[PDB]
Design an enzyme around this catalytic site. Structure first.
Site, PDB file in Angstrom:
ATOM      1  N   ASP A 181     -28.498  75.946  56.897  1.00  0.00           N
ATOM      2  CA  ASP A 181     -29.770  76.712  57.031  1.00  0.00           C
ATOM      3  C   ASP A 181     -30.973  75.744  57.002  1.00  0.00           C
ATOM      4  OD1 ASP A 181     -28.585  79.231  57.270  1.00  0.00           O
ATOM      5  OD2 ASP A 181     -29.515  80.124  55.500  1.00  0.00           O
ATOM      6  N   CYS A 215     -29.488  77.518  70.712  1.00  0.00           N
ATOM      7  CA  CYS A 215     -29.624  77.735  69.262  1.00  0.00           C
ATOM      8  C   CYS A 215     -30.598  78.902  69.090  1.00  0.00           C
ATOM      9  CB  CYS A 215     -30.011  76.419  68.588  1.00  0.00           C
ATOM     10  SG  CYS A 215     -31.381  75.520  69.380  1.00  0.00           S
ATOM     11  N   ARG A 221     -31.288  71.881  67.629  1.00  0.00           N
ATOM     12  CA  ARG A 221     -29.802  71.671  67.675  1.00  0.00           C
ATOM     13  C   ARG A 221     -29.309  71.517  69.128  1.00  0.00           C
ATOM     14  NH1 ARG A 221     -28.315  76.534  63.370  1.00  0.00           N
ATOM     15  NH2 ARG A 221     -30.005  76.011  61.900  1.00  0.00           N
ATOM     16  N   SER A 222     -29.813  72.336  70.038  1.00  0.00           N
ATOM     17  CA  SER A 222     -29.448  72.301  71.474  1.00  0.00           C
ATOM     18  C   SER A 222     -29.763  70.903  72.056  1.00  0.00           C
ATOM     19  CB  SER A 222     -30.214  73.389  72.218  1.00  0.00           C
ATOM     20  OG  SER A 222     -29.682  74.686  71.949  1.00  0.00           O
ATOM     21  N   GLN A 262     -36.487  68.622  67.174  1.00  0.00           N
ATOM     22  CA  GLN A 262     -37.654  69.323  66.532  1.00  0.00           C
ATOM     23  C   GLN A 262     -38.169  68.584  65.277  1.00  0.00           C
ATOM     24  OE1 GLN A 262     -35.781  73.453  66.388  1.00  0.00           O
ATOM     25  NE2 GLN A 262     -37.908  74.039  66.753  1.00  0.00           N
TER      26      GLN A 262
END
Ligand SMILES: NNC(=O)c1ccccc1OCc1ccccc1
Length: 284
Positions: A181, A215, A221-222, A262
């Protein structure tokens, strides 16, 4: 400069935040005018994450051709990827329309439907064999065929039927279920294992349309997934694998979709997955 040594030099100096901001400063800026039209406000999950006009995927319908999705085309590596947001309640039909129209074999999902107590994407695939999903807006049917649940990921076999023509295709769903998370994984082992299972499937191969990767926003994440894959493929292909500059690869990818990677922690993790993958092909 061997990305390994560059990695120790940044870690010892604790400059991850400064490298990351240099990337943000040099990244391409192209127009996203279609994404900002008022008719498309409910097709966008996040106001600050839009596909560039030059690289956006178009739906094959005259009504409204818009989806929050970008084709990443890597010329040197001969690899292509569609990066998209997690589908919304009103874009689940658009999502499967895009999979059909682009001739994708695989969907890669890097998030859970619920994280941090909030919904990150719609429940867009069937959970039971005998309860199929019909998308009436795009005339598609989706059936769960089988499910293989492992410790770090789940692979599903799906059948997508174009109800207009009664053609069917098998779509593989690769679901990475253990990204935490907060932060990034401590070891890239299970992520790198997942990438190699995607590849083994044929989903990343030129006889199919581009893999669809998502994602929640389709950039973090992508971004890590496609950066890691392209990096390791270039090292395989070049006479000098030490010439592969991860920062230059990421800026090339940012010509096609904004915001890929990110945080400074995802950059470090991207560095680690590639370095660990590198230190594994060689037979560490
Ligand atoms: N998984 N499928 C794909 O990557 C793909 C889908 C359509 C066309 C080509 C594809 O790859 C080869 C390739 C990649 C970049 C440039 C030229 C050629």
């Amino acid at each position: 400069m061997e990305m390994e040594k560059e990695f120790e030099q940044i870690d010892k100096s604790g400059s991850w935040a400064a490298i990351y901001q240099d990337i943000r400063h040099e990244a391409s800026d192209f127009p996203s005018r279609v994404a900002k039209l008022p008719k498309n406000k409910n097709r966008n999950r996040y106001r600050d994450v839009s596909p560039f006009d030059h690289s956006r995927i178009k739906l094959h319908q005259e009504d409204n051709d818009y989806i929050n999705a970008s084709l990443i085309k890597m010329e040197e590596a001969q690899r292509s990827y569609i990066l998209t947001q997690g589908p919304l309640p009103n874009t689940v039909g658009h999502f499967w329309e895009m999979v059909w129209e682009q001739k994708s074999r695989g969907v890669v999902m890097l998030n859970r439907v619920m994280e941090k107590g909030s919904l990150k994407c719609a429940q867009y695939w069937p959970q039971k064999e005998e309860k199929e999903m019909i998308f009436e807006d795009t005339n598609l049917k989706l059936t769960l065929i089988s499910e293989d649940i492992k410790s770090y990921y789940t692979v599903r076999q799906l059948e997508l039927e174009n109800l207009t023509t009664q053609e069917t295709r098998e779509i593989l769903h690769f679901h990475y279920t253990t990204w935490p998370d907060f932060g990034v994984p401590e070891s890239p082992a299970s992520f790198l294992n997942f990438l190699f299972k995607v590849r083994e499937s044929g989903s990343l191969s030129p006889e199919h349309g581009p893999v669809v990767v998502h994602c929640s926003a389709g950039i973090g994440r992508s971004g890590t997934f496609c950066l890691a894959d392209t990096c390791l493929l270039l090292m395989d292909k070049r006479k000098d694998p030490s010439s592969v500059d991860i920062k230059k690869v990421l800026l090339e990818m940012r010509k096609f979709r904004m915001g890929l990677i990110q945080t400074a922690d995802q950059l470090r993790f991207s560095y680690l997955a590639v370095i660990e993958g590198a230190k594994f092909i060689m037979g560490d």
